Design a protein around this ligand. Structure first.
Ligand code: CLA
Ligand code: CLA
Ligand code: CLA
Ligand code: CLA
Ligand SMILES: C=Cc1c(C)c2cc3nc(c4c5[nH]c(cc6nc(cc1[nH]2)C(C)=C6CC)c(C)c5C(=O)[C@@H]4C(=O)OC)[C@@H](CCC(=O)OC/C=C(\C)CCC[C@H](C)CCC[C@H](C)CCCC(C)C)[C@@H]3C
Ligand SMILES: CCCCCCCCCCCCCCCCCC(=O)OC[C@H](CO[C@@H]1O[C@H](CO)[C@H](O)[C@H](O)[C@H]1O)OC(=O)CCCCCCCCCCCCCCCCC
Ligand SMILES: CCCCCCCCCCCCCCCC(=O)OC[C@H](COP(=O)(O)OC[C@@H](O)CO)OC(=O)CCCCCCCCCCCCCCC
Ligand SMILES: CCCCCCCCCCCCCCCC(=O)OC[C@H](COP(=O)(O)OC[C@@H](O)CO)OC(=O)CCCCCCCCCCCCCCC
Ligand SMILES: CC1=C(/C=C/C(C)=C/C=C/C(C)=C/C=C/C=C(C)/C=C/C=C(C)/C=C/C2=C(C)CCCC2(C)C)C(C)(C)CCC1
Ligand SMILES: CC1=C(/C=C/C(C)=C/C=C/C(C)=C/C=C/C=C(C)/C=C/C=C(C)/C=C/C2=C(C)CCCC2(C)C)C(C)(C)CCC1
Ligand SMILES: CCCCCCCS[C@@H]1O[C@H](CO)[C@@H](O)[C@H](O)[C@H]1O
Ligand SMILES: CCCCCCCS[C@@H]1O[C@H](CO)[C@@H](O)[C@H](O)[C@H]1O
Ligand SMILES: CCCCCCCS[C@@H]1O[C@H](CO)[C@@H](O)[C@H](O)[C@H]1O
Ligand code: OEY
Ligand SMILES: [Ca+2]
Ligand SMILES: [Cl-]
Ligand SMILES: [Cl-]
Ligand SMILES: [Fe+2]
Ligand SMILES: [Mg+2]
Lengths: 34, 64, 34, 36, 38, 342, 114, 81, 38, 30, 504, 33, 57
């Protein structure tokens, strides 16, 4: 269904964006705890 | 305390106070039975509730 | 110094994310006409 | 032989007043329904 | 980046105003379209 | 012996912003699911097929009129499991058949269990007595008697409360009209417990705030307290004299005072719970038989009791057909009870 | 013995530990939803029911001048104009039963205006 | 304190806002579209304003059988032309 | 015989087991990674 | 009979007020 | 000293006197059962099991005796209508007597155990202190229970060595005590299959024996012993209370919904049988069958058993009573004397009309008559001035088929209306309202009262479980918390793990 | 009024039995030194 | 006669009320907001019929 991709696309772009911005600190935290 | 014949007879049945098996003992086994029991309950509930409907099981006064 | 992804982080977002989504949905509903 | 587990019992006056008030108010409440 | 840049009172203000906007929208909706009795 | 159980126990009981604990495993999903369930339903789900009612924001209802309504009377007391024989795994149908109601009520029940286990768990970790949990027994008694036992006594879930503001109001009015619930002495005890509770809350709070010791120089008295101070922050002696002279009696024991504040509303709620358990069976405090015999024989005998019965009869006749659509009540205008003119 | 005897009228020291209670309730919810100031706590105990009952009283006092509860009777209408009932309308049905039966002999004219 | 970064610390940081000035509007728009595309109706089986009744009908499509409820609703939906 | 509802029962059973299982597997994993200091 | 009962209980409660107020345990400071 | 609400705590470390108290409680309960049975027997009218069975008469324990095979009096009557029976010793009176005597014996034993409380048996052999080994005690008691359960199932219920149990047809017409074979298939879990009751007690009994042997021979694991505080008898109080409110909710439920162990001839019909017109459907089915076989209306209806008709009447619905409407149902609508017969209403055009039956929810209900298609055709109007459906306008008559009024037709509006008013209650009966000075207001049956009492007790006992469980797990802080509680144990972050001082 | 006559004794006992209970407890408390 | 339609409502114990049904009945609708002290009545019987006690109380 096209409406499902239409509705999910903003959220997926949001998730991708926050991942883009937070990834280095995230791997820093994951590595630190390990 | 006062001793009696019946008391002396029963005395060993009340002599292991505080005696335990070390660690977890048969706890795993117990857990299993509890699991089983839960499913059993779930079944008889859902049969009674008509959420679980079995062939030949007519949950009604018109059972016999 | 501080962790980013914690239990508190997860608790906050399980409530916050659907909340903003829902607010968007209800906002949209205000323009529905019979 | 005297049992060593015996304990004295108490009810102070304030507890007497509270208790009497509870019983009497409960009676005042339920009596209508008892008479019906 | 470093926590503390954007003054809290500004954040509070913008947030509050957002709340007022959305709730205002809902009250507007009480008088228009669905559920408006018209 | 540091096995996996003990390691897990370590992690669950870490001092974090939101304490988890073992109880948390039950509490958090269930609570979350109940809340989400009510939010989803009231936002999106109709009551058209079960009640003939709109009940969501999506349909035009507002915060007061939205609800997650009970299932159709035809469902009986079905668990209405998503994968059950009624919905058969169909999410949409499940929503239209009232599945969200059992979903919310059941996850809510287990959620409450979880919360009280949480009270016990934290109490045990911190070293305090578990009176908060014990007190919480009362909300659980209420919830269980009203949302589970009461419909279980009746024909179906349909007559349980629906989860909404106006829906609950309807529940109230229904209990007046059909059960004469205001006449029930168990409800009366509940009312006494709740209002007595509110009263104690106000009066204890005000008394403490108005018998404060001057422990600071500022006109805001809040600053002049320290959580670790040993001294009492207000004068029990002055409080005692004030109330003894105003009202005749006063507390003199602080422990007894706070216990009493526990006792009153908890007990009230438990009593109302018992009454509702009676109403599950229609075991009502509906009539006074002596009144009815006298009034039947004596058309000049009138009391507020007979007056209220006339009101109940009106409520039943006028709300039943729309409130109980499955019954297909057709009440011609001519049979409707009405006073003159109205 | 009763725990209450652990408190003696007029004693200078507090009879419970507010830090323990705070630690407990604060972990029950989260830290910043628990009072650590007994004064501000007791003030809250005072204020909430008092303000609430003020509003209840104002409710009765303003409905005394017939500024009444929300009316959503037939607020929801479908595309054709059919009334879609809500719980508000069910409430209205019950309200109607009350209205028509109350003081059954006292009204001669069709509106009960007081 | 329990070790987590203080909220006041986070919600006044530039980074928090870089992230959330995107993620929040995106969710909002996602929900908005969830309604505006009509997807919500079909997901939850809520009637649209023109589908509570058939054109001449005034009876409610009330479910009256426990185990055939699904079929009943489907039938009702068929009868909507 | 396996009625449709008996099948439904087994599906509910397996769903619950999978939910609990994943939950506890995650919990145990995290517990083993992020240990308390003594 | 009922009336006598109701009024009796009531009267007992008023008597109880009297005693609880004037013949109470005195609060004693310690 | 002890506050009034703790006086019984003196028994906690005194096994002998604990046993004396338990003996006294048991004596009291047995005495209650005996006295209750004697009272019922002194008031029970056995003369009409059809229209005046025990559940109309406020009988509470009589049905529990009947359920397990005690159906007879020494005076020569039985609850199923037989006369001249010899029930042997185990008549109602015999059962009552045996409970009274048991009560006396338990009283004497209670005295003995009260006076001779200091028995060596109650002392721990190593420490000399009073001690009960609860795990082994549990094994022993569980084994005994398993034995009893098994024997009850295998000998009593089957009739191998015993009477069996009350069983009936689906409409509760022909109930009697019968030996019951176990049902070993899935229908064994059908609450309406009594074979399942039998099977349950045999299987659960064996399981209880096995489990009992296990708990006799295998000690608790250290971690469960500590966690559950198995050295503390109050833990047993808590879990026992839990089991007991569990059980209580279950018997409340099966009493309300019905099952093979709550027969309608002993406790009365369920509310749901009225909700779904259970009896009306069977009545109609039989009548249709007769008409099919060429019988006349009068024949078809006169063939309907009064018992069956009496079930199809809302006055026997347990959801019609009231909390303070006391006594037997006979005290409400009266002592049923006879079926008046089935009322058939017709209008001027000769259409058959049907009275809308009263739903259990309503204390009162309008009188409304429809045709087969549910169209309103007549009623008893409230406002007369715009009445269109009055019996007078519609020329409504009533004719009776079967019962004492068989063959009669009434045409005067007041009479027809009287019968329509009765018709909202279902089938119509003649009642003796004089004998008991019945007040005309519906009361609930033993099914209702049982269900109410046990739902309420189950709920209260939940609180009991909470209270004692708490006391067990928090015994160390019962009198209050540590005066030296370190502020840092309760403040945040000091310990990594809450409450664990080793994690600072 | 046709009240249930048992009401009388039901009420009387309802008041007397527990009240007496309390009174016993109170008096023997006072008579202790 | 609370509602002023010569339809007197019984509120006292002696006149067929129990604790739950009993009341001091509001003064008559015919009086409205008029002040009705005892001395405005021609007799105590009048005063009682019209619900004066409610106002005094
Ligand atoms: C974590 C705590 C928790 C608890 C206590 C519950 C409890 C419940 N859920 Mg909820 N749920 C949860 C979390 C929880 N849920 C989560 C995280 C989700 C999102 C996935 C859901 C999503 C959800 C939905 C969509 C629904 C429920 C429903 C329910 C109710 C029925 C449950 C049932 O019958 O399962 C039975 C399963 C078990 C009891 C598992 C026991 C496992 C045993 C002990 C082990 C043996 C299994 C064995 C290996 C399997 C063999 C299979 C083989 C024979 C084929 C019950 C109130 C239903 C409901 O509310 O109906 C109205 C429903 O429709 N839940
Ligand atoms: C092997 C053959 C066999 C057969 C044919 C039976 C047959 C039966 N068993 Mg038995 N059983 C057996 C072996 C067998 N059993 C064995 C080996 C054991 C292990 C010892 C058991 C243990 C057992 C238990 C514990 C129970 C049964 C019950 C039953 C009856 C179920 C029908 C019913 O009325 O459920 C009615 C009961 C339920 C459907 C379960 C209710 C579960 C509740 C709802 C859980 C929630 C409780 C909660 C606190 C309620 C509060 C919330 C509420 C207020 C809203 C039926 C006679 C049940 C019974 O006696 O019913 C009268 C029952 O409770 N059996
Ligand atoms: C399981 C319990 C139980 C049940 C279900 C029954 C059921 C029945 N009894 Mg039996 N009975 C019982 C135990 C029970 N009995 C006991 C223990 C006794 C010895 C006293 C009796 C002695 C007895 C006699 C002498 C008679 C009956 C009769 C009956 C029948 C009529 C019931 C009735 O009118 O009650 C009416 C019920 C009420 C009015 C409800 C009482 C509500 C209480 C008072 C509320 C108390 C509130 C409390 C004070 C609140 C405290 C608050 C505080 C904690 C803060 C009915 C079949 C009658 C019958 O028909 O015989 C053939 C009859 O004559 N019973
Ligand atoms: C197997 C059942 C059982 C047993 C053996 C006990 C035993 C005990 N309870 Mg527990 N309790 C129970 C169930 C039980 N309880 C239930 C169901 C509840 C919820 C109501 C409680 C709530 C409770 C509280 C809040 C407390 C106890 C306490 C106690 C201890 C002291 C009791 C005492 O001295 O009272 C003495 C009682 C009296 C002198 C008069 C009581 C009069 C009652 C209220 C009315 C009369 C009842 C009537 C005669 C019998 C009706 C029988 C009924 C089952 C049908 C004792 C260990 C106390 C404790 O822990 O001490 C440290 C305590 O504070 N219990
Ligand atoms: C309507 C009245 C009412 C509400 C809303 C309420 C709410 C609450 N009470 C709580 C506590 C208490 N209440 C207590 C005594 C009382 N509580 C009372 C009445 C209420 N109490 C009364 C009258 C008393 C006097 C005895 C005590 C002693 C406590 C606590 O200790 C505890 C607390 O912490 O207070 C600060 C909290 C439990 C938190 C929780 O369980 O999270 C978990 C959430 C779960 C498990 C979800 C529950 C799901 C519910 C049951 C069904 C679904 C409901 C929908 C989501 C919403 C429906 C809304 C419509 C009806 C309009 C919560 C704030
Ligand atoms: C030692 C003292 C013991 C007694 C204390 C004093 C009693 C106080 C009053 C309690 C009983 C009040 C009964 C109503 C008045 C009356 O006259 O009844 C009178 C009724 C008897 O009913 C009579 O029966 C006659 C024929 O036998 C006639 O029909 C009479 O008209 C009819 O009134 O008494 C009972 O039947 C009660 C028996 C017990 C039934 C209990 C079932 C419910 C129990 C669960 C409730 C638990 C609630 C816990 C809440 C917490
Ligand atoms: C300023 C707003 C006033 C709102 C109404 C009054 C609220 C306070 C009165 C409660 C009386 C309780 C009995 C006495 C209890 C008592 O003795 O109080 C004592 C308490 C402390 O007294 P202090 O002497 O320290 O301070 C008061 C003065 O002396 C000034 O310092 O007084 C206050 O805290 C006043 C707070 C003013 C600001 C309060 C704002 C609260 C309203 C917030 C908005 C809520 C709206 C909700 C709508 C849905
Ligand atoms: C309604 C509640 C109002 C509380 C008072 C208003 C907050 C404002 C206040 O009084 O203090 C202000 C306070 C400031 O916190 P900070 O920035 O100093 O945070 C420091 C900590 O992170 C250090 O560990 O705000 C908060 O702590 C967060 C507020 C809620 C944040 C959302 C958390 C949600 C968690 C999920 C729910 C868990 C429930 C658990 C039990 C079931
Ligand atoms: C059911 C279900 C589920 C779940 C889901 C969920 C979990 C959801 C969630 C959801 C959510 C979570 C939602 C939310 C929402 C929110 C909202 C909607 C909010 C709103 C708010 C507002 C509007 C506000 C207001 C206010 C107030 C209240 C006060 C202050 C002021 C103001 C005005 C701000 C699942 C899938 C599992 C399965 C199926 C079924
Ligand atoms: C000595 C002796 C003898 C005798 C014995 C006897 C004679 C006995 C009797 C016994 C009895 C005769 C008993 C009885 C009992 C009873 C009871 C124990 C009851 C109780 C009751 C109750 C507890 C109730 C309560 C209530 C009320 C009142 C109200 C309502 C509610 C209720 C239910 C809660 C002989 C010769 C044999 C031999 C040996 C010696
Ligand atoms: C649910 C409780 C099940 C505990 S199981 C327990 O777990 C230990 C590790 O914690 C193992 O070392 C031990 O062998 C095992 O029996
Ligand atoms: C302790 C004194 C009680 C004595 C009562 C003994 C009754 S014995 C009883 O009596 C009946 C007489 O018809 C017989 O039917 C029955 O078979 C017989 O067991
Ligand atoms: C004018 C009355 C003519 C019809 C008779 C009334 C319907 S039938 C009537 O109903 C009574 C209950 O009210 C019973 O007590 C009585 O036994 C029964 O004959
Ligand atoms: O409720 Mn309706 O509206 Ca205020 O008056 Mn007009 O009838 Mn009457 O006097 Mn009492 O009450
Ligand atoms: Ca249009
Ligand atoms: Cl009125
Ligand atoms: Cl008028
Ligand atoms: Fe306080
Ligand atoms: Mg709108």
């Amino acid at each position: 269904d096209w409406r499902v991709l239409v509705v999910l696309l903003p959220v997926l772009l949001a998730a991708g964006w926050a991942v883009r911005n937070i990834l280095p600190y995230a791997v820093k935290q994951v590595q630190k705890l390990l | 305390a006062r001793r009696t014949w019946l008391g002396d007879i029963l005395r060993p049945l009340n002599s292991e106070y505080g005696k335990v098996a070390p660690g977890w003992g048969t706890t795993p086994l117990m857990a299993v039975f509890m699991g089983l029991f839960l499913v059993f309950l779930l079944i008889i509930l859902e049969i009674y509730n008509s959420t679980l409907i079995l062939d030949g099981v007519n949950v009604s006064w018109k059972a016999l | 110094s501080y962790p980013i992804f914690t239990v508190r982080w997860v608790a906050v977002h399980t409530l916050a994310v659907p909340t903003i989504f829902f607010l968007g949905a209800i906002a949209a509903m205000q323009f529905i006409q019979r | 032989e005297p049992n060593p587990n015996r304990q004295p019992v108490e009810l102070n006056r304030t507890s007497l007043y509270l208790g009497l008030l509870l019983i009497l108010v409960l009676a005042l409440l339920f009596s209508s329904y008892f008479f019906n | 980046s470093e926590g503390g840049r954007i003054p809290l009172w500004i954040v509070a203000t913008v947030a509050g105003m957002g709340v007022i906007v959305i709730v205002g929208l809902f009250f507007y909706g009480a008088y228009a379209g669905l559920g408006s009795s018209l | 012996e540091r096995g996996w159980f003990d390691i897990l126990d370590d992690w669950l009981k870490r001092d974090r912003f939101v304490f988890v604990g073992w109880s948390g495993i039950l509490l958090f999903p269930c609570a979350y699911l109940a809340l989400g369930g009510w939010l989803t339903g009231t936002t999106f789900v109709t009551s058209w097929y079960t009640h003939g009612l709109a009940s969501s924001y999506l349909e035009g209802c507002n915060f007061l009129t939205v609800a997650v309504s009970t299932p159709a009377n035809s469902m009986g007391h079905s668990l209405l499991l998503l994968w059950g024989p009624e919905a058969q795994g169909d999410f949409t149908r499940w929503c239209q058949l009232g599945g969200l109601w059992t979903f919310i009520a059941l996850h809510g029940a287990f959620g409450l269990i979880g919360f009280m286990l949480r009270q016990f768990e934290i109490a045990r970790l911190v070293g305090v007595r578990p009176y908060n949990a014990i007190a919480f027994s009362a909300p659980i008694a209420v919830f269980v008697s009203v949302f589970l036992i009461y419909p279980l006594g009746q024909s179906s879930w349909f007559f349980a409360p629906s989860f909404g503001v106006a829906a609950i109001f309807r529940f109230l009015l229904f209990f007046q009209g059909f059960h004469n619930w205001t006449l029930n002495p168990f409800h009366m005890m509940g009312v006494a417990g709740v209002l007595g509770g509110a009263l104690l809350c106000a009066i204890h709070g005000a008394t403490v705030e108005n018998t404060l010791f001057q422990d600071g120089e500022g006109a805001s008295t809040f600053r002049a307290f320290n959580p670790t101070q040993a001294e009492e922050t207000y004068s029990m002696v002055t409080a005692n004299r004030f109330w003894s002279q105003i009202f005749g009696i006063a507390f003199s024991n602080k422990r007894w005072l706070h216990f009493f504040m526990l006792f009153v509303p908890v007990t009230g709620l438990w009593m109302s719970a018992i009454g509702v358990v009676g109403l599950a069976l229609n075991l009502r405090s509906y009539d006074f038989i002596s009144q009815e015999i006298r009034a039947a024989e004596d058309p000049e005998f009138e009391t507020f009791y007979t007056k209220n019965l006339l009101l109940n009869e009106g409520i039943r006749a006028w709300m039943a057909p729309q409130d109980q659509p499955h019954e297909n009540f057709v009440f011609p205008e001519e049979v409707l009870p009405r006073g003159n003119a109205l | 013995e009763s725990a209450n005897y652990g408190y003696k009228f007029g004693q200078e020291e507090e009879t419970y530990n507010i830090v323990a209670a705070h630690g407990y309730f604060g972990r029950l919810i989260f830290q910043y939803a628990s009072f650590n100031n007994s004064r501000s706590l007791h003030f809250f105990l005072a204020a909430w029911p008092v303000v609430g009952v003020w509003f209840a009283a104002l409710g009765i006092s303003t409905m005394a001048f017939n500024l009444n509860g929300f009316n959503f009777n037939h607020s929801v209408i479908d595309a054709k104009g059919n009334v879609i009932n809500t719980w508000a309308d069910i409430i209205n049905r019950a309200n109607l039963g009350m209205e028509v039966m109350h003081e059954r002999n006292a009204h001669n004219f069709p509106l009960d205006l007081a | 304190t329990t070790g987590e970064r203080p909220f006041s610390d986070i919600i006044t940081s530039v980074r928090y806002w870089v992230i959330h000035s995107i993620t929040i509007p995106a969710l909002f728009i996602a929900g908005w579209l969830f309604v505006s595309t009509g997807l919500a109706y079909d997901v939850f089986g809520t009637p649209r304003p023109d589908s509570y009744y058939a054109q001449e009908q005034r009876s409610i499509p009330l479910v009256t059988d426990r185990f055939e409820a699904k079929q009943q609703v489907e039938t009702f939906l068929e009868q909507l032309k | 015989t396996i009625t449709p509802s008996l099948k439904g029962f087994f599906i509910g059973l397996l769903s619950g087991a999978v939910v609990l299982g994943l939950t506890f597997a995650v919990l145990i994993a995290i517990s083993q990674i992020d240990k308390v200091q003594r | 009979m009922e009336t006598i009962t109701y009024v009796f209980i009531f009267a007992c409660i008023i008597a109880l007020f009297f005693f609880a107020i004037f013949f109470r345990e005195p609060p004693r400071i310690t | 000293g002890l506050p009034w609400y703790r006086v019984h705590t003196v028994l906690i470390n005194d096994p002998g006197r604990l046993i004396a108290a338990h003996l006294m409680h048991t004596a009291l309960v047995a005495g209650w059962a005996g006295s209750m049975a004697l009272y019922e027997l002194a008031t029970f009218d056995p003369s009409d099991p059809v229209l005046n069975p025990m559940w109309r008469q406020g009988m509470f324990v009589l049905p529990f005796m009947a359920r397990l095979g005690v159906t007879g009096s020494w005076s020569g009557w039985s609850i199923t209508g037989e006369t001249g029976i010899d029930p042997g010793f185990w008549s109602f009176e015999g059962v009552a007597l045996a409970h009274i005597v048991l009560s006396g014996l338990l009283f004497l034993a209670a005295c003995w155990h009260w006076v001779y409380w200091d028995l060596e048996l109650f002392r721990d052999p190593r420490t000399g202190e009073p001690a009960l080994d609860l795990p082994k005690m549990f094994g022993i008691h569980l084994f005994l229970a398993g034995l009893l359960c098994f024997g009850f199932g295998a000998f009593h219920l089957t009739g191998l060595f015993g009477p069996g149990m009350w069983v009936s047809d689906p409409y509760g017409l022909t109930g009697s005590v019968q030996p019951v074979a176990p049902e070993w298939g899935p229908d064994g879990f059908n609450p309406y299959n009594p074979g399942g009751v039998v099977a349950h007690h045999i299987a659960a009994g064996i399981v209880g024996i096995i489990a009992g042997l296990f708990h006799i021979l295998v000690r608790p694991p250290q971690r469960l012993y500590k966690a559950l505080r198995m050295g503390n008898i109050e833990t047993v109080l808590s879990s026992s209370i839990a089991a007991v409110f569990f059980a209580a909710f279950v018997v409340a439920g099966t009493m309300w919904y019905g099952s093979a162990t709550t027969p309608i001839e002993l406790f009365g019909p369920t509310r749901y049988q009225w909700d779904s017109s259970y009896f009306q459907q069977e009545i109609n089915r039989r009548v249709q069958a007769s008409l099919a076989s060429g019988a006349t209306l009068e024949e078809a209806w006169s063939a309907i058993p009064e018992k069956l008709a009496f079930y199809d009447y809302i006055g026997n619905n347990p959801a019609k009573g009231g909390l303070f409407r006391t006594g037997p149902m006979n005290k409400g609508d009266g002592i049923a004397q006879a079926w008046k017969g089935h009322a058939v209403f017709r209008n001027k055009e000769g259409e058959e009309l049907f009275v809308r039956r009263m739903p259990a929810f309503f204390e009162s209900f309008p009188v409304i008559l429809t045709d087969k298609n549910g169209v309103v055709k007549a009623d008893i109007p409230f406002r007369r001035a715009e009445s269109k459906y009055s019996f007078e306008q519609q020329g409504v008559t009533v004719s009776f088929y079967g019962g004492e009024l068989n063959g009669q037709t009434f045409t005067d509006p007041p009479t027809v209306k009287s019968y329509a008013r009765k018709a909202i209650f279902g089938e119509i009966f003649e009642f003796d309202t004089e004998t008991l000075n019945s007040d005309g207001i519906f009361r609930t049956s033993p099914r209702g009262w049982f269900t109410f009492a046990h739902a309420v007790f189950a709920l209260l006992f939940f609180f009991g479980h909470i209270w004692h469980g708490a006391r067990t797990l928090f015994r160390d802080v019962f009198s209050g918390i540590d005066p030296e509680l370190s502020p840092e144990q309760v403040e945040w972050g000091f310990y990594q793990k809450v409450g664990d001082v080793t994690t600072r | 009024m046709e009240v249930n006559q048992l009401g009388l004794i039901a009420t009387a006992l309802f008041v007397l039995v527990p009240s007496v209970f309390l009174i016993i407890l109170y008096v023997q408390t006072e008579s202790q030194q | 006669d609370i509602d002023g339609i010569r339809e007197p409502v019984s509120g006292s114990l002696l006149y067929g009320n129990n604790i739950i049904t009993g009341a001091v009945v509001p003064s008559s609708n015919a009086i409205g907001l008029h002040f009705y002290p005892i001395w405005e009545a021609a007799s105590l019987d009048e005063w009682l019929y019209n619900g004066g006690p409610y106002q005094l109380i």
